[PDB]
Design a protein around this ligand. Structure first.
Ligand SMILES: CC(C)(COP(=O)(O)OP(=O)(O)OC[C@H]1O[C@@H](n2cnc3c(N)ncnc32)[C@H](O)[C@@H]1OP(=O)(O)O)[C@@H](O)C(=O)NCCC(=O)NCCS
Ligand SMILES: CC(C)(COP(=O)(O)OP(=O)(O)OC[C@H]1O[C@@H](n2cnc3c(N)ncnc32)[C@H](O)[C@@H]1OP(=O)(O)O)[C@@H](O)C(=O)NCCC(=O)NCCS
Ligand SMILES: CC(C)(COP(=O)(O)OP(=O)(O)OC[C@H]1O[C@@H](n2cnc3c(N)ncnc32)[C@H](O)[C@@H]1OP(=O)(O)O)[C@@H](O)C(=O)NCCC(=O)NCCS
Ligand SMILES: CC(C)(COP(=O)(O)OP(=O)(O)OC[C@H]1O[C@@H](n2cnc3c(N)ncnc32)[C@H](O)[C@@H]1OP(=O)(O)O)[C@@H](O)C(=O)NCCC(=O)NCCS
Ligand SMILES: CC(C)(COP(=O)(O)OP(=O)(O)OC[C@H]1O[C@@H](n2cnc3c(N)ncnc32)[C@H](O)[C@@H]1OP(=O)(O)O)[C@@H](O)C(=O)NCCC(=O)NCCS
Ligand SMILES: CC(C)(COP(=O)(O)OP(=O)(O)OC[C@H]1O[C@@H](n2cnc3c(N)ncnc32)[C@H](O)[C@@H]1OP(=O)(O)O)[C@@H](O)C(=O)NCCC(=O)NCCS
Ligand SMILES: CC(C)(COP(=O)(O)OP(=O)(O)OC[C@H]1O[C@@H](n2cnc3c(N)ncnc32)[C@H](O)[C@@H]1OP(=O)(O)O)[C@@H](O)C(=O)NCCC(=O)NCCS
Ligand SMILES: CC(C)(COP(=O)(O)OP(=O)(O)OC[C@H]1O[C@@H](n2cnc3c(N)ncnc32)[C@H](O)[C@@H]1OP(=O)(O)O)[C@@H](O)C(=O)NCCC(=O)NCCS
Ligand SMILES: CC(C)(COP(=O)(O)OP(=O)(O)OC[C@H]1O[C@@H](n2cnc3c(N)ncnc32)[C@H](O)[C@@H]1OP(=O)(O)O)[C@@H](O)C(=O)NCCC(=O)NCCS
Ligand SMILES: CC(C)(COP(=O)(O)OP(=O)(O)OC[C@H]1O[C@@H](n2cnc3c(N)ncnc32)[C@H](O)[C@@H]1OP(=O)(O)O)[C@@H](O)C(=O)NCCC(=O)NCCS
Ligand SMILES: CC(C)(COP(=O)(O)OP(=O)(O)OC[C@H]1O[C@@H](n2cnc3c(N)ncnc32)[C@H](O)[C@@H]1OP(=O)(O)O)[C@@H](O)C(=O)NCCC(=O)NCCS
Ligand SMILES: CC(C)(COP(=O)(O)OP(=O)(O)OC[C@H]1O[C@@H](n2cnc3c(N)ncnc32)[C@H](O)[C@@H]1OP(=O)(O)O)[C@@H](O)C(=O)NCCC(=O)NCCS
Ligand SMILES: Cc1cc2nc3c(=O)[nH]c(=O)nc-3n(C[C@H](O)[C@H](O)[C@H](O)COP(=O)(O)O)c2cc1C
Ligand SMILES: Cc1cc2nc3c(=O)[nH]c(=O)nc-3n(C[C@H](O)[C@H](O)[C@H](O)COP(=O)(O)O)c2cc1C
Ligand code: NA
Ligand code: NA
Lengths: 67, 68, 67, 67, 68, 68, 67, 66, 68, 68, 68, 66
């Protein structure tokens, strides 16, 4: 039957975790169709003088391959 | 000594991660007593027109068992 | 080359996940210099009458060792 | 929003892996509604004089909780 | 064929690891039948003035489902 | 020496596990050359009226990269 | 009490997963007694013109030690 | 340099975890020399009327090859 | 809110697992305050003429950080 | 903010582990820009008459996506 | 079809990682035939006055079983 | 009995994995005594024009507490 592909992206944001996830998905939507689900693999980030600099959310994004 | 049970729930929300966790715990409190801690096992979700459609947080919820 | 150290902290907050992460980092910067990155190992928490009582984020914090 | 529960079952069969999975799901269907997805956690089994005696498939079954 | 259910319990005891496991299994047998095997998932515990306060053993318990 | 790429696909089938794997590989062969090995990462699926609706096998597929 | 040993084998078959498992167990029983249980560790395989060339199932086989 | 072998055994005991580990090691020493270290991989067991029937400790045993 | 630190210790004992855990915690309390919980990461050991020589329990110990 | 892509490669070399990693990165830089970091996932290899034939290093490579 | 066996060895060397792997494989080929692949499970070692004393590479070695 | 501490360090080197491990251990020996064993947890690194820029070996270092 149907076949899906999963790609691993890292979304980033200074604002928070949801914003980082949304950034990855917004970029994926620019070029990929039939985006269906995501899976967070890791949460990492950088540190600056005020604490978190960048939140970095590593996620897999699954999409249906067209026929 | 005391014995606990852990149950695996999936909370969902369109709003965010915290809201998804809170939804699972609010449902658990309707029928379970002595809810003590949770552990997030996975964060997953669905995708729609605006990016995230539903955040889905898979968590274990630990509660103390009453004596029989 | 240079050497880094990683320490494991648990930040807590009633407010949310980001707040718990920031609490750990704020404590770290009181005494540690050259804080560079973090890795979330676990998200846990406690439960009370309002649902989540404390969010607890277990993270590794990496920093460069001086000299 | 909606809340799901996951339960861990072990389906067994002398015939094969699919039969073991189907046995677990058939039993779940007797008493649970809104069964949605499954995740295989482990494949194990017993050995007899002719090789595999019983295939044992450990799986999580997710279902939507009714309101 | 036969179907088993696994449940995740946490047994606790001040006395030791075996005692913590036994506490979980004793509670399980008050209400569950055909208990067959267990799997330890984690060993944790709390700390007090004299070292270990409670040993806490997280384990899966498997039991055969009755058939009707 | 040689360099390979691994891509993560999900094959699906109503028929079984082997059929789901085969579906992923048949699709991969339409556009990729030098397909060499696969690794099953997960087995998942959906549930319907007759039990399993779709078997979903998540696998990594390794292929040798051609020189540029 | 009694003691068991576990050995790691890889069964292969062009036919399917069950056949690969059975091939490993058939080889094991030629020389090992008191074969009791198996645990699948990995499912892998090779690819050729027809899709799957060989299914390869990595499993642990547990047996009771005599005496 | 020196090469070690690891084998995976499962010791059992009705009494406890240490006894199960010791049972595996006692059997290993009957036929294997230069036993050096062990690693517990899993703790499992069976259930009976008294609670635990058998503790089953799965462990890797490392020994120096002669 | 409150911040905790985790440190990784290895307790050892010829006597058993509980004794090895207790040895790590006894040493920890000589210098660390507000010790709260532990997590066993690994159980390992050495072998001698009579079987187990030393039990070695690798554990994480969590403690609440004092606020200055 | 900025978005990165990770791809999983397997570099190989008869010479050693570093050479296997370098082979993957050399191939990646022929076609990918803004390569930033890598993560080794597995070390494997093949065996021949004289011991190691090929070292095989499975690694994730992260690169920053260009923005338009 | 064909059946393989995997055995777990630890190669050691003062020189480096490749040398430790090669030591395990050199010993394996003294007694085992049809050695095909290896998988590194762990890299560990001992420490002495000058840093690394022994590199210790824990690996699985797979070989094809002869058919009688 | 005896108690050990483990600390997690990241050694780096442009040259290779062994050199990165040795850098971490050389730094540890400046201030820590009774260094006994290490465990590699991760191998990561950065990429530059020459391929690898820095190898980064994350390792646990175990030492006996005095
Ligand atoms: C169906 C299900 C989701 C409904 O859950 P629920 O909304 O919590 O409703 P329940 O019937 O379980 O109610 C909770 C019960 O636990 C009791 N309870 C609550 N907290 C407790 C505690 N800490 N200690 C002991 N008992 C407690 C409640 O009193 C209530 O018992 P009662 O109805 O006898 O008075 C749940 O029962 C379930 O997941 N069952 C498992 C299904 C399964 O695995 N089936 C096998 C298919 S093969
Ligand atoms: C800052 C840091 C990196 C410096 O490490 P360092 O180079 O070893 O410097 P130290 O001053 O600690 O020297 C090592 C100490 O261990 C002692 N020591 C060395 N070997 C020892 C052994 N085997 N057993 C017991 N003590 C030993 C030394 O004598 C010295 O003791 P002293 O501080 O009482 O003089 C280290 O202290 C650190 O990682 N701190 C963690 C801080 C932290 O996590 N902060 C909380 C943030 S929220
Ligand atoms: C208790 C503890 C949390 C306190 O942390 P702390 O407040 O940061 O104090 P530390 O001395 O450890 O670390 C801070 C020091 O590191 C040094 N330092 C900071 N950043 C550094 C860096 N990048 N490189 C080198 N040194 C650095 C500073 O000199 C500082 O000293 P200061 O507070 O006077 O400015 C910490 O020391 C600890 O985890 N100790 C427990 C150790 C243990 O495991 N005990 C054994 C039990 S069996
Ligand atoms: C004993 C057990 C296996 C029986 O499972 P079961 O046959 O599915 O029966 P349950 O009562 O749990 O669940 C069925 C009930 O859930 C309810 N239900 C079914 N689907 C539901 C859904 N989607 N949402 C909410 N409720 C649902 C129904 O009311 C149903 O009753 P019904 O079958 O008459 O229609 C299961 O309840 C169990 O594993 N219990 C373990 C208890 C335990 O862990 N004890 C602690 C020992 S220390
Ligand atoms: C609350 C809870 C811990 C209480 O467990 P408990 O003390 O074992 O009490 P139960 O009411 O479940 O009794 C055990 C049931 O299992 C049945 N049972 C026992 N062994 C069985 C077996 N081998 N096969 C089938 N059924 C069995 C018993 O007959 C009994 O049902 P009965 O009262 O209808 O005869 C347990 O029911 C539970 O974990 N439910 C959680 C509900 C949940 O997850 N809610 C959703 C929150 S969002
Ligand atoms: C969209 C997608 C699924 C379509 O895959 P596809 O059906 O295989 O189609 P492709 O365009 O990739 O065709 C395969 C290409 O690989 C080449 N190729 C096949 N095997 C090869 C090999 N072994 N070595 C080198 N090149 C090979 C083919 O010649 C073809 O190249 P060409 O069109 O330049 O001639 C796939 O391109 C993809 O998943 N891209 C990644 C998307 C992504 O991650 N986006 C980021 C969002 S933030
Ligand atoms: C059957 C089995 C459990 C019996 O184990 P055992 O009690 O140790 O019996 P053994 O006869 O092998 O005795 C141990 C051997 O190791 C040797 N030995 C002991 N310590 C040694 C050491 N440190 N270094 C090298 N050799 C050593 C002994 O001298 C003896 O050698 P020998 O057979 O040449 O006389 C064991 O052989 C086994 O697990 N076989 C695996 C078979 C298998 O996987 N089959 C494939 C199925 S598809
Ligand atoms: C090569 C190998 C696969 C051959 O396996 P095998 O054909 O089963 O031969 P083994 O002697 O090991 O095991 C079979 C023996 O175990 C014994 N045995 C069988 N079941 C047993 C049980 N339940 N309890 C005790 N002994 C048993 C039998 O006496 C049998 O001898 P037999 O073939 O004459 O009937 C196996 O011996 C092996 O894995 N060797 C490699 C060891 C190694 O790691 N080498 C070091 C490299 S550095
Ligand atoms: C470079 C890269 C990040 C760009 O990703 P991208 O912006 O999404 O562009 P892609 O060409 O890969 O994918 C988009 C194309 O996929 C196709 N596509 C989109 N959705 C699809 C779907 N559901 N099914 C099939 N095709 C689809 C479209 O034709 C699309 O072209 P379009 O955007 O003009 O409409 C991505 O291709 C990549 O990661 N490549 C890595 C290459 C690599 O690993 N090299 C080996 C180094 S050793
Ligand atoms: C086949 C494959 C390995 C070839 O990889 P390749 O040698 O890198 O060649 P590509 O054609 O992908 O070239 C790299 C592309 O990434 C783009 N790119 C490089 N770095 C980039 C960056 N930092 N940001 C955005 N794009 C970038 C390049 O510009 C180029 O696209 P262009 O030719 O349109 O300019 C690779 O495309 C691939 O893995 N696709 C697999 C397809 C797949 O999974 N198919 C589904 C089977 S079911
Ligand atoms: C002790 C041990 C390390 C010695 O390893 P070794 O030096 O390779 O020596 P072995 O005795 O195993 O000899 C290798 C055997 O494999 C056979 N062999 C080699 N390659 C083979 C292949 N590809 N296919 C089939 N057989 C093969 C050899 O011919 C030899 O058989 P033989 O002894 O009947 O002549 C190893 O046998 C072992 O780990 N056994 C321990 C058993 C155990 O776990 N004991 C139980 C303790 S509780
Ligand atoms: C060497 C070491 C094992 C000694 O541990 P120790 O016996 O507990 O002794 P410490 O020097 O850490 O003293 C404990 C400190 O924690 C403080 N403390 C205890 N509990 C505390 C708490 N809950 N909150 C805050 N501080 C606390 C103590 O007051 C003491 O501080 P002080 O030294 O300023 O008086 C430990 O400090 C260590 O592992 N450091 C190694 C650093 C390292 O990694 N070196 C870099 C090598 S590359
Ligand atoms: C990340 C984390 C893990 C914890 N794990 C356990 C546990 O294993 N068992 C337990 O009884 N308490 C556990 N606790 C609770 C603590 O032991 C302690 O009771 C609580 O944090 C209050 O500590 P304080 O009074 O020092 O603030 C955990 C707490 C945190 C922050
Ligand atoms: C489970 C398993 C894992 C394998 N892993 C690798 C690998 O890591 N790298 C590789 O080049 N070949 C790998 N192979 C291929 C084998 O090394 C070998 O080439 C193949 O099984 C043919 O062996 P034979 O000629 O002895 O039958 C693997 C094979 C199996 C069965
Ligand atoms: Na040596
Ligand atoms: Na001791």
């Amino acid at each position: 039957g149907k076949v899906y592909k999963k790609v691993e992206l890292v979304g980033t944001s200074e604002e928070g975790l949801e914003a980082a996830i949304q950034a990855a998905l917004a970029r994926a939507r620019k070029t990929l169709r039939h985006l269906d689900w995501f899976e967070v693999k890791e949460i990492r980030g950088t540190i600056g003088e005020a604490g978190v600099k960048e939140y970095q959310v590593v996620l897999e994004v699954g999409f249906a391959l067209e026929e």
